[PDB]
Amino acid sequence: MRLIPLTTAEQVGKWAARHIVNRINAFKPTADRPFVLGLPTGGTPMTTYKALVEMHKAGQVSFKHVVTFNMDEYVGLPKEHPESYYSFMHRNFFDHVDIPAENINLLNGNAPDIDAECRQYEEKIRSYGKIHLFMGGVGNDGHIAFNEPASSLASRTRIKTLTHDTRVANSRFFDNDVNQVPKYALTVGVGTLLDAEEVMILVLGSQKALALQAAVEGCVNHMWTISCLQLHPKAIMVCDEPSTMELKVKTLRYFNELEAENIKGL
Amino acid sequence: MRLIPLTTAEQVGKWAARHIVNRINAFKPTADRPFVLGLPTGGTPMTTYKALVEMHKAGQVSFKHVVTFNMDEYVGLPKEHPESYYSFMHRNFFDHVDIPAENINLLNGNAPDIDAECRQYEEKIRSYGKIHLFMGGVGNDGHIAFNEPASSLASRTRIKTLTHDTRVANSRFFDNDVNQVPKYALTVGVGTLLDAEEVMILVLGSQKALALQAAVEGCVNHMWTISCLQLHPKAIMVCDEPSTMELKVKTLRYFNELEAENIKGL
Amino acid sequence: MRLIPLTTAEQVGKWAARHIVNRINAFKPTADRPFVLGLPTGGTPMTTYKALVEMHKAGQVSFKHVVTFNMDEYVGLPKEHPESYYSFMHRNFFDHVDIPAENINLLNGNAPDIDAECRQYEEKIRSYGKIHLFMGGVGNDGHIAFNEPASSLASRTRIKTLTHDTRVANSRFFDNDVNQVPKYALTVGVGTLLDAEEVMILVLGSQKALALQAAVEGCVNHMWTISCLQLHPKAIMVCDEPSTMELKVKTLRYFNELEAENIKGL
Amino acid sequence: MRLIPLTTAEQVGKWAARHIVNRINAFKPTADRPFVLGLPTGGTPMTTYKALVEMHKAGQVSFKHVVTFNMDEYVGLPKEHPESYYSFMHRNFFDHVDIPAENINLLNGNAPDIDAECRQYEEKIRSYGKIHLFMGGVGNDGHIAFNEPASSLASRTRIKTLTHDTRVANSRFFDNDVNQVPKYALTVGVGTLLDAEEVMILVLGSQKALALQAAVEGCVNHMWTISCLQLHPKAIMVCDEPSTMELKVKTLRYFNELEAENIKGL
Amino acid sequence: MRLIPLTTAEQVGKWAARHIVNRINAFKPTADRPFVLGLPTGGTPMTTYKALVEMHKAGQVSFKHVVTFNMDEYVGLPKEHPESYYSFMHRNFFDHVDIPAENINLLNGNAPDIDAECRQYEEKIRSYGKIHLFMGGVGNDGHIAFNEPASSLASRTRIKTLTHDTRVANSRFFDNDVNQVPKYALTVGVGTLLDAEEVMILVLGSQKALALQAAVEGCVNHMWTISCLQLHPKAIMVCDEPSTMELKVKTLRYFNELEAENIKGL
Amino acid sequence: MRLIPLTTAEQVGKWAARHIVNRINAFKPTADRPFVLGLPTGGTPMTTYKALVEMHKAGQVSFKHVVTFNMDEYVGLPKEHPESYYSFMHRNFFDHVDIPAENINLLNGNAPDIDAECRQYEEKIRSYGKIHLFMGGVGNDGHIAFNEPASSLASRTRIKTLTHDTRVANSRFFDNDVNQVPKYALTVGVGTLLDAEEVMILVLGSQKALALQAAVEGCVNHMWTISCLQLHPKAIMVCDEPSTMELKVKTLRYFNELEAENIKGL
Ligand SMILES: CC(=O)N[C@@H]1[C@@H](O)[C@H](O)[C@@H](COP(=O)(O)O)O[C@@H]1O
Ligand SMILES: CC(=O)N[C@@H]1[C@@H](O)[C@H](O)[C@@H](COP(=O)(O)O)O[C@@H]1O
Ligand SMILES: CC(=O)N[C@@H]1[C@@H](O)[C@H](O)[C@@H](COP(=O)(O)O)O[C@@H]1O
Ligand SMILES: CC(=O)N[C@@H]1[C@@H](O)[C@H](O)[C@@H](COP(=O)(O)O)O[C@@H]1O
Ligand SMILES: CC(=O)N[C@@H]1[C@@H](O)[C@H](O)[C@@H](COP(=O)(O)O)O[C@@H]1O
Ligand SMILES: CC(=O)N[C@@H]1[C@@H](O)[C@H](O)[C@@H](COP(=O)(O)O)O[C@@H]1O
After folding, report:
1. Quick one: three-class SS letters along F221-238?
2. C1-266 adopts what CATH topology?
3. Which residues, numbered 216 to 245 in chain E, qualify as contacts with chain C under a Cβ-Cβ cut-off of 8 Å?
4. Which has the closest alpha carbon to C182: C78, C86, C74, C41?
5. Which residues form the active site (chains A, B, C, D, E, F)?
């Protein structure tokens, strides 16, 4: 696992965007061989989306040949609701880039047949082969996507019932009313993520400090699903300062020496 | 992982039996495509066996097309001994149902070639493809089948030496004489169980409270082999009240909200 | 997992050598079907190398048909340096046995293309199929090979930056000057080791007590990479007395009863 | 320790306030023998001060012979500042009760000699002899009063430097500008608190769930000073529902039945 | 702390009983200066009372000038009930020794004013001044006397409500009917115990293995009140073999060599 | 607790030595009111004694009215032996300062009645009244003085039997022959230490990293007696860089800013 210890969310987003652009550009995607990118929503990826749009506008990247897959979506939330994940992704990313509409994949939380929706979603990823880079965040309770505590570390895309705390946390976007936050969501499983070629998790803020420690210094367990990355051959966690506060001095020292050159864009 | 928090062993057995019957019936087994069921012995599955026999007698299930595989068997215990696992399974289940004798699989603890016995057992499961549902219990020390502490989480069917505590625990059936409990047993491995399509563990009594916590809230480790279910994509633990006492309030609250409808047979 | 609780490093080496000889002899290697052995360096395997040379001289084993692969090698250390792993292996083993030079595999820490070196190394193991028995030691911090804390449990052969503590520990061989210990090394990954048919770890001295406990009684985690053996279907740890001091009385009692006969060569 | 498991903050306040009134009335304070009360600030005791004001107005209690001591005060913040603990206390409590100015004892955070201030404060308590009941809350990191992690469990009243985390927590009352909150504060020590005849801690909210677990289920340590209550002969923890989420089912079960009759008052 | 590692309960009793006799005889009790002895009930001290009776009959000790105090007593159970601690003590000890009735002090669980009872009890001890040796056992959850988990480490003699687990444990003496065991009990507190000049705890059985580990290797906390012995200047733990199974090899090693000569008495 | 985070042992010594001088000079010792100083041996305080000698020679401090007490002494080792703590103290400190022989108090490990020795020692301290400052180090397993793991947190001066590990640690001064180091030692107890008005512990080296974490972040327990400082009202830990490697980033951050001005002295 690589851990990039940065100072601010701004730097985090600049590092992540830069890494994505480099993967894409080094890959040289075509219409017959596209780059498959997995994406998250939430407050965490905002700086990364901001920097990506910039770079695109500056002619640094083209998503003309990039296929995207999102991690999850709320169940029973109208697609046009400002807070639906479909809305988020268009408002903050899709509307500003040159990605073909047929290249965008999102789960339908209003699918009449939930199981069919999830299976087809997995079948859609398979037809492309694999996700080259899956970007994500981490929940306060250590959840990756909506794979809440007690989720199988070998789980696939399926419906999950949101923890009360996740709902309270997400009430931010629902004018602080937990009663308005959807109780369920369609989400890719831990095994789905483990199948990605590279996984990049963004960690920002003190609220994630415990989740980072569980991920870095904790053991593999299903209560903190982010611990699954210990089993992934190519995981990177990009962090800011407050999120590293629960780590041991030696752990951070090691990562600091490691990424010294790699983080000095300046 | 799903955890069904019930109150009594009676309810546990009624839930388990019901789940098995539904799997079988929904599967619609034929002679060319049989349902493969993995089974345990011990005090734990008694209520489940009781309810299964009932349902069969009431014409709710037919084991005419069900192939069974048992988890383990004592080494060096005569097959006719009342306490041999072969005896247990016939006395409490086989004698009362319409399952063909050629459809029953049990390990021979008196096999002259222990390795040959175990290999053939694994070869027999393979010829059928896979075990559709493996039912089991959990030991006080967290063992699944006889995969005692320090057993490989990728182990296959093999011979294992019983822990002293397991023997003392099992002395119940040997008129409380530990000296009469077999020191060894042939058992399916953790990897053998992980290969099952669905795994259903029954947890009953306060003696299992620590094992349940290790399974639900603990990390993956080989000292408590029941933790292997965290790696299984389809595990269910059916519990009574005393076995949930070591769990965190939040953990039980989550599972209670989850199974509210699913447990209200009434 | 099997754990052989011996008393001295001498006995440890005699047990390990004996086990290797038995594997080789029982295997009956030919030029068309050679025995593939993975090997370590460091202070730990000295007694085992000593006993192996003896047995060979006594006509008990022939490495004429054995292919070897070493775990790691220092980056940027001249091959002729007495402390290079290449030097170690020739000085303490190769020079004294009848193994063909074309049967020896070592990583080139001076490879101009580090990635190419590591990939080819993995390709070389694959061409042979698999490593039949991989012998190794364990670091104070729980590292297996140079898979330092925070290494992926699914990692392959690659370059790794040595922890400061590992360097201080290895300064023994560099006349106690940490500044002389190479900062990097080419090493086989955890997944590379997990792929071996059998893994035998030698644990000697009180300095390894914490690493042994992490391995035996701890949970699977990437901070203590030796915990990966819990996932291996055929691991054995051969220990002396001081290295078992952190284990629970019950754990050692179990292993003592288990290996009573198997360790009484006398 | 007694732990009163309630559902709501309103209930906590009603319970706590009734407890104080009962103790005072049983004591029968007079001019020569006043009842000494220790009090806190923060959002936690708001419902309690409210209820207390209700009871006084209703003629249920009089503070005419109650001497009070507050836990702490910010250093350098002007007395008349709306957020000084002096203002909080008057705005929320003193302004509505019949307590004579003589009886109010608050730490002077703007004293010329901070060392002398703290010492005279401890002297004040001693002069009266003993604080009969000390009410307080608990910080998110378990700090009691301003005895931050790593404070001595035998500490007395002194100047203390706040944890960045505490400042972030308190920034709420300073328009969320961490730069606004005072870096230092005068506070009673853990020893001062342990000297109190009875200690009642109010726990409200999910943010305090870890602190509550540390206090009830953890060991005594100076990182979570709230754990010092395990050494107190008369300690009570009054909690609302979300604060008990990290406790064990058995832990909450025990307390629920103990306090059953004691909370049915409604 | 001293820990006497023995093999059998008979040895524990013989050791413990010799210790008491030695202390008494060294003390040279008289009418004005009696030796004060604290005593427990339960299955644990059976071998000790037996040995003690043997020694007295043999003319080795006399209790004519020994004042005794028992740890606890069930509330509401009639004195003459075969299971009241009053009956246990007489049936098993007093009936066979020369202790005058005056010297026997037991808690009256059927007193009209439970509060007054506990207080007078503490007064009794103070009148004599000090308990020279307090013998006791440890519950499965580490409770000492009836100071159940969450009791204050500074508690005094008071009424206590038993844990459901304790009641299940004690149901043995009530024909295994949990409904038969008293929900309450008067008991000496942890403080009362810590006031004893010397405390000797007998640990027998596998059921006490976790409690013994908590006491010796755990931290001080009120969940396992037996941990309070870490703060005692003169504490001894006398154990049989299965009770030491959760300790570390090094822990038991240390104690074994310390007590080597001390237990060879046979 | 205060923790002074320094980089080098030289800095630790300079800091610690300045602290002692400051305290002495502020105290203004005289013949009737001497300053009582507790002192340790071992490699840890070498830089401190050196600095102290420098300051005395420079006319900054005088020990003419300082009474000193040492923590411990080997039993059975002749006084004049180069490694007796008596020799260490004179060779390294007393020989260079103006302290009169009358003022030196060392434990006599070759006394005819070890019990009487320890008791008179405690009497010596009491006669002076109080040790104003006790300087000491911490063992690798966190033992303070020779109060090895499992010593009472309320212990007094007594004979103690060393842990094999401690002997291995001290064999350095006995030509690395463990057989050379004394199995027993007279030592001040944890209680004796807690009675000191102020306790300053010097922590140097990576070998002490776990002990430092136990002391600062662990719970109070008798396995790591250094944890007793959490109950002390005036404790200071002076550390070099590698000793802080197991602490949390936040823990070291806190202390760094507290002591910022306090260590800039250089
Ligand atoms: C409607 C609903 O919420 N269904 C989910 C199911 O999809 C999931 O598989 C299981 C937990 O299992 P997992 O997290 O291990 O997949 O919980 C619930 O049954
Ligand atoms: C006769 C006997 O008891 N043999 C078992 C062996 O079958 C098992 O493989 C090993 C533990 O390994 P495992 O639990 O990881 O398979 O212990 C013993 O050697
Ligand atoms: C030059 C160097 O040191 N490169 C390594 C890289 O090879 C390794 O993959 C990664 C940790 O990841 P891993 O331990 O999980 O493979 O750390 C560093 O980036
Ligand atoms: C100005 C200031 O912040 N002073 C405090 C001091 O009062 C306190 O004693 C010590 C920690 O110790 P304690 O928390 O154990 O008293 O830290 C700081 O030096
Ligand atoms: C009737 C009854 O059960 N009373 C006890 C009380 O005596 C005890 O003080 C408290 C717990 O506190 P302690 O264990 O810390 O004294 O719980 C209960 O209220
Ligand atoms: C000769 C010898 O080694 N005596 C000590 C004794 O002095 C000490 O009190 C006890 C442990 O108790 P403590 O460490 O709690 O005092 O162990 C040993 O018996």
Report:
1. CCCCHHHHHHHCCCEEEE
2. Rossmann fold (3.40.50)
3. 244-245
4. C74
5. 72 (proton acceptor), 141 (for ring-opening step), 143 (proton acceptor), 148 (for ring-opening step)
